[PDB]
Design a protein. Structure first.
Lengths: 155, 153
């Protein structure tokens, strides 16, 4: 039985994966993230405002991965042997400081790979249904904002 | 008489200004910077590889600002103050930590405004001629790399 913030934290990886599956490689770079209670904000680098349809497909794909109850594997490799095992993709827009040389790369098979040290749930089913509440595109910096929240319907 | 590093530091702001004059608003966000001796690397967020011509125009503009010997004014306002004086423009792609509440905004009139705490030269003339050695565009992250160096003699 995990907290709601650990839940929400894992959802970020799930939503990130769905964002990429719908929008493609152009949206694979995370700019930043934020978790507060059952609310989360994923900001990914992108160039346009997704149509309401893509947004729904993102949400549905996220929720679908939750139902699949896939395992969230947390490897803890070197840096390079993590580097050419997962590649560039495990990093965010702004890589981790060089004074770090032991990465905890969180992975969800064929979905998302990210260097993260926060606490995660063992499987995706423990996250629960995710709902996207607001999508904001910021032309200037070219950043896409995905606001979502975990739901409490018996979960 | 300033060091080479302080000179190079200042050139960054000059080059940044030139980069925006040529490429426009789309390139106003700095991703990161690096100074080593007389070499500098300005990485700005952008979506394309500038043509050889634009690169030259950047370089020429940069050097033109150096000859103008304009004053590099270093204001030091409390955080929320310098916000509506200079606006979002004084920041980089990734803003400064919230645990900072007193900014040193370096400015070059109608050229560039940036929150920086490094040491700068009083005027642009003390920077000297700037030379761009390599421009790299990274499609994936959408970042443009402007490598340059100050000249000697």
């Amino acid at each position: 039985m995990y907290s709601i913030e650990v839940r929400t934290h894992s959802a970020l990886h799930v939503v990130k994966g769905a964002v990429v599956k719908v929008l493609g490689s152009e949206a694979k770079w995370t700019y930043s993230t934020y978790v507060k209670g059952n609310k989360g904000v994923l900001i990914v680098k992108f160039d346009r405002k997704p149509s309401d349809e893509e947004i729904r497909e993102i949400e549905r794909l996220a929720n679908e991965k939750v139902k699949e109850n896939a395992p969230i594997k947390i490897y803890e490799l070197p840096r390079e042997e993590a580097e050419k095992m997962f590649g560039e993709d495990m990093y965010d827009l702004f890589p981790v400081p060089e004074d770090v040389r032991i990465l905890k790369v969180v992975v969800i098979e064929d979905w998302n790979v990210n260097a993260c040290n926060k606490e995660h749930t063992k499987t995706t089913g423990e996250i629960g249904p995710i709902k996207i509440r607001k999508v904001r595109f910021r032309k200037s910096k070219g950043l896409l904002e995905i606001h979502f929240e975990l739901l409490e319907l018996e979960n």
